[PDB]
Amino acid sequence: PPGPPGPPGANGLSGERGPPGPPGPPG
Amino acid sequence: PPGPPGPPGANGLSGERGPPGPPGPPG
Amino acid sequence: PPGPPGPPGANGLSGERGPPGPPGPPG
Numbered sequence: 001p002p003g004p005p006g007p008p009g010a011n012g013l014s015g016e017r018g019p020p021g022p023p024g025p026p027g
Numbered sequence: 028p029p030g031p032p033g034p035p036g037a038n039g040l041s042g043e044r045g046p047p048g049p050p051g052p053p054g
Numbered sequence: 055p056p057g058p059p060g061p062p063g064a065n066g067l068s069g070e071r072g073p074p075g076p077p078g079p080p081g
Binding site: 001002003004005006007008009010011012013014015016017018019020021022023024025026027 | 048
């Protein structure tokens with residue numbers, strides 16, 4: 001019969017770090 | 028003689044959400 | 055009998071980008 005399924009793939013990488021936060025408030 | 032190759036393995040799951048961005052620029 | 059293992063699965067896609075960072079410090 002057909003052989004075993006191949007190995008599962010690995011889980012994906014974590015996403016990219018988010019954008020910078022908003023500018024802080026005036027002094 | 029041996030049978031046919033098995034099917035392709037399962038694809039991996041999508042990765043997790045990326046980390047928060049850095050603090051914003053100063054005021 | 056069963057044939058060779060099938061091809062490896064593809065790895066998962068990368069996760070979504072993280073959220074924007076927090077507001078910056080005061081001036």
